[PDB]
Amino acid sequence: IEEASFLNGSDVVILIDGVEELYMEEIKADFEQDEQSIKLLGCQNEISRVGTTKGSFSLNGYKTDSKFAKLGFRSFEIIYNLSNSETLGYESIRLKNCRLKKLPLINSKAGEIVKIEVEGSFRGYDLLNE
Amino acid sequence: IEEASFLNGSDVVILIDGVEELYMEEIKADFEQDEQSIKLLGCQNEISRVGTTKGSFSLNGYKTDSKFAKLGFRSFEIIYNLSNSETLGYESIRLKNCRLKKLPLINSKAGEIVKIEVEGSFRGYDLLNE
Amino acid sequence: IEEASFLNGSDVVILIDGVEELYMEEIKADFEQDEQSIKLLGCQNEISRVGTTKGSFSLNGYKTDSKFAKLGFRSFEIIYNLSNSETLGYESIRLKNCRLKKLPLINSKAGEIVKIEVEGSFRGYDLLNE
Amino acid sequence: IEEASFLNGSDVVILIDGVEELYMEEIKADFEQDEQSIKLLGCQNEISRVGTTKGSFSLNGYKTDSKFAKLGFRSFEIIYNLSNSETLGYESIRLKNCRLKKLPLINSKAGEIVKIEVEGSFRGYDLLNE
Amino acid sequence: MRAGIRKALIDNIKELKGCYEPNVPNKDTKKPYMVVVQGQDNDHGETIGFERSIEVWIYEGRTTFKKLDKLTKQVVEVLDMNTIVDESENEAFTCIYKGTSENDIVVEEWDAIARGIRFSVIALEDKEDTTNDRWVEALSRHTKDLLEIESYKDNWKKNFIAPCALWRTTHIENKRINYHLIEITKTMKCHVVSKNKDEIVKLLETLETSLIIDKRVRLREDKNMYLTLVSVVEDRESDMFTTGQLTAVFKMIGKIKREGPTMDKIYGNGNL
Amino acid sequence: MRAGIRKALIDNIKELKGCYEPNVPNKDTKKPYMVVVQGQDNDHGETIGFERSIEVWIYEGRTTFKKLDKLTKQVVEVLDMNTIVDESENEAFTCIYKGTSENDIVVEEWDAIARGIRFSVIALEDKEDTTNDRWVEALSRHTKDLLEIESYKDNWKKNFIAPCALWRTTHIENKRINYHLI
Amino acid sequence: AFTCIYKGTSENDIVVEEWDAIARGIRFSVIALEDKEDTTNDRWVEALSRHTKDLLEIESYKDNWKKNFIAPCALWRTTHIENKRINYHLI
C-alpha cells in the first residue's frame, strides 16, 4: 500500500500585488472559454472551438484591513503557492491583471466575525511551477 | 505565537443621516462596476475596463421607530465605524447620497420580533479612515 | 432467490489522454440532442427529431498535480472502464475530442482537501465494450 | 371501517422495448399540452384550449448493463404495469415512440452505487388496462 | 472440569504438593496445596452464553507471602487462556484469568496464608461450532484463509484456541428495493482474541486492510454470490469477549426467483 | 409444579434415589437425592407476565464433586425447555435453565456435597392464549402456516413448546390522513 | 519495578483498644500488572510516541500503561479506527 497524499487546502499562500496575504481562507480561479458551437451540413454532431478566453476569480477571508477598498479597480497580480508536504512539489500559479468586480466596502453582521468577499476577472495567467 | 485579531462585527457603529443608529444587526455595501468586456479584433483573450460604477447597500435590524418609513426616498448619508480593539485602528467608511430602493412600511410576523430590512443605492463613498 | 448485483462506483478506472487517472472521485458524461420539435399542420401530436448531438462531461476528484491546468483546451480522449466483479462484464466507454470548458486553475478552501472540478464537451464516443 | 388500499410503488413492472426491466427505481411520465390562452375581445376572463400535446418521461434505477447506451436515440415502446394486490386490478399504460433526450453514457461517483437516469419524450400513449 | 484444572496445575507446577477439592484436605496435608472451587454459571448473552466462574485457592505454610506471590504468578501463567483437556469428561475448555480474591487472608488456626485466583470459562452450553448464517460462514472461512487462525462462527466455544477470531452477526435489515430485487444488510461484528495484545492489533489491522482492498467476499466456493462491504470500523477499547473490536457492515442484493410457466404454444384465429 | 418437576426428575434420571420437598429428608435418606425449592413470583412486564423461580438442589454423598457435575448436567438436560405436565394440577409448564447456585457447597454435618441449579417459569397467570389484536392473530397464523411451529400471539404462555414464536404488538399509531381515510 | 498511585484512606481512623494503638489505612494501587512489553504493532502510535518523546523530553508508553511508568510521561493509545475505500486506487 504505497504512500499517497492529498494537498491540504491550508498550505495556500496568496500574494496579492507583491505583499503576502495572511487572512484569506478560500480562493477560486478559472479560465473560461466561449464554446462557439457550429452546425455543419452533413455532420450531425456539433463541433466546438476555443473561442476567446476570459478569466474569473474569487476570494474569501477575514477582514484585517481596508486593503481591498483602497485598491479600487486597479490592475494587480495574484500569486498562489499550493505547497505539498509529503513531497515538496509546490504548485505555483500567477494571475495577470486581476481587476475587482466590486469593492466590498462594508459586509458585517452583528454576531459574527467580519469576513471579506472579493471577485473579479484576470486577463491571463502564468503557470510558474507545478 | 504572535498576536492576530479578527474584527468582530458587533463593533460596528452606523450613523444614518448624522444620527447614530443603534438597532442595526448587519450592513452590506458594495461598489459595483459594469465590466464592459471588449473582444479585440486580433487578440484571443477578452479585455475588461472599469466602465461605470454604481453603489448598492442593505441593512437589517430590529424595528424601534418609523425612521426609514418617514425618511422616504430622500438622499441621506451613512457612516460606518468598524472599530478594532486589540489595536485601535478603526476602519471608517462614508456613503454619499444613499437612496432607499423600497420603503419598508410593514414587515411583521405574529410570533417573532419585528425586524426592519432596507436596501438601496449610493452614488459614491469616502474612505474616511482605515 | 437468485443472484443480482450493483455496479459499485469505486470500480471505475478513468484514463485521461492515455495515462491512468488515480484520484478521480466522480465522472459524468451525456450525449445531448437538440430535439427539433415539429408541429405538423394537421396532426395535434407534436413530433420530435434527432437533431444535432452534443456531448458534455464532468469530473470531480482530489488535486494531485497540475495535469488539467497544463492541459489547456487541447483535444484529448477519456476512457472509462466500469468493471463488474460478480461477473466480469466490464462496461468500457471512450470519449473522443474532449475539450475542457474552463481550466480549474485554483480552487482551494482553507480547512479542506483541495478538490479539482472539470467540465467540458466531447464530439463523440465509442462504446468499446459492454 | 371498510377496507381501502393505496398502490405501493414496488408493484411496478416496466417493459422497455418488449424486454422486462428489473432495476428501475422510479418512473415518471406526463402528457403536456400547450395551453393556448385566448383573450377574447369582449369577455374579461381568459379562455384556454387543448392546443397540441407533447409527451415527456423520466426513469431512474441501478446500472446493470449498457442497454440505454446501445439504444441510442432510437424509437422504442415502454409498457408500465402497476398491480393492486389487494384487488388485482392492475393499471397498465403503454407509451408509444419514446425517444431518449440524452444517452446516459457515464454517471458514477466513487463511493456509491452506479445509478442510471434517463429522460426523453413520447409521441403518444395507449391506456391498455385500468 | 475440576479434573482438568487439577491435572494441569499438578503437571505444570512442581512446587505444588497437591490440588484438592473444597473440603478434602486435613490438617496434616503438606503445603503448598491448591483448592479448586467452582462458582456460578450465569447467562451472559448470546455471544458468551453461559459463563462459569472458578477459583483456584492457593495455600502456603505462612513462611512469607513472597512465595505465595510467586506461586500465584505460576498458576496464572499455567491456566490463563491455555486450552485444557479434561480426560475424565473427554472435553476441553480454556480458562480466562479474571482477577484475584478480595484480600490476602491469613488463617491462624490452620497456620497458613491463602490467596484466591479467580478464573472463568465461556460458553458452557455451546457444543457445535456451526451456524445457519451463510454470511458468517463465508466471513469466518475468509478470515481463516487470510489469517491462518481458528475462526468460530456464531458464538464463543469453551475450548477456543487463542489466538482466534469470531464473526457473529449483530443486526439484520431487509428491504424490497424493487419489484424483483431485495436488499439484505447485516452488521457483523468481529472479535480477535489472543494472549498478546499487539498480536490482536496486528490481526485486526490486516483483517481491516484485507476487507477494504478486496471489497467483497465470496459467499460460497460455488461463486454466484458476493458480499459487498459497506463500512469496516474498529473500536479498540471495546471488550475482547463480550462486544468485539471490529464492526463491519455488509450488504447483498438478491433477485426474486420467479420461474412461472412459459408461452410455449401460441395460436390465434380470425373473423370480420 | 413441585409434583411435575419431581416426577420428571425421577422418571428421567435413574441415579436419583429420591426427590423431596425442602425440609422433608432426614439423615437416613439415601444419596444422591434432590430438593425442589420454589422461589419468588415477580411481574416481568407484559410479554413474560409473572415469572416464577425454581431451584433444584442436588445432594451427593461427598465421594467426589465429579458425580455432582454429571448429575447437574443430567438435570439441566432433563428440565431445560422440555415441556412438563403436572398430573396433580393437570397443567403443564416449561422450565427455563437460568444458572447455578453461588458456590459448590460442602455440608459437613450431613456429610454431603450440594449444588443448586436454578430454573424459572414464564407467564404464570396467563391461561388463554388468545388476542383481540387482529393483526397479531393474522401474523401468528401466517407464521404457523409458513413455518410449521407454534405461535402464541399476545404474550408467552407457561407451557410453550420450543421451537415457537411470539408475535406481540409493541406500539400503535393512528392517523387520519384524509377526511375518509385513516 | 512499579509505581504506586495514591488513591485515598481507610474508612475511619480506628482505635484498637486491646493492642493499645491507633491505626490508619492508606490506600494505593498499581497499574497494568500483566503488561511486560512496552511495544506496539500500531505504527501510528509508535510514530506519535516518538514525536512526543522528541518534542517533549519525557517518556512515552505507546499502547497501554506499564506498571513502572516514570512520571511525568505521556501515553498514546488508539481508541477508534475507520477505513474507507474512497476510490478504486485509494484508501
Author numbering:
A (entry chain F), B (entry chain A), C (entry chain E), D (entry chain D): 7 to 136
E (entry chain H): 1 to 272
F (entry chain L): 1 to 182
G (entry chain N): 92 to 182
Q: Could you give the paper's own sentences about this structure?
A:
Here, we reveal the extended and contracted atomic structures of an intact contractile-tailed phage (φCD508) that binds to and penetrates the protective S-layer of the Gram-positive human pathogen Clostridioides difficile. The virion can be divided into five distinct regions: the head, neck, tail, baseplate, and needle. Structures of purified φCD508 virions in both extended and contracted conformations were determined by single-particle EM of frozen-hydrated samples; the resolution ranged from 2.6 to 4.0 Å for the extended phage, and 2.9 to 4.2 Å for the contracted form.
The overall RMSD between all proteins of the neck in the extended state compared with the contracted state is 0.34 Å, indicating that no large conformational change occurs in this region during phage contraction. After contraction and genome release, the neck-proximal tail sheath protein (gp55) remains attached to the tail terminator gp53 via its C-terminal insertion domain. The neck-proximal sheath protein rotates to accommodate the contraction-induced movements of the other sheath proteins in the tail below, pivoting around Gly260 in the gp53 C-terminal linker. The terminal sheath ring proximal to the neck proteins still maintains some contact with the tail tube. This reduced rotation is limited to the proximal layer, with the next layer below fully dissociating from the tail tube, similar to the arrangement observed for the main body of the contracted tail reconstruction.
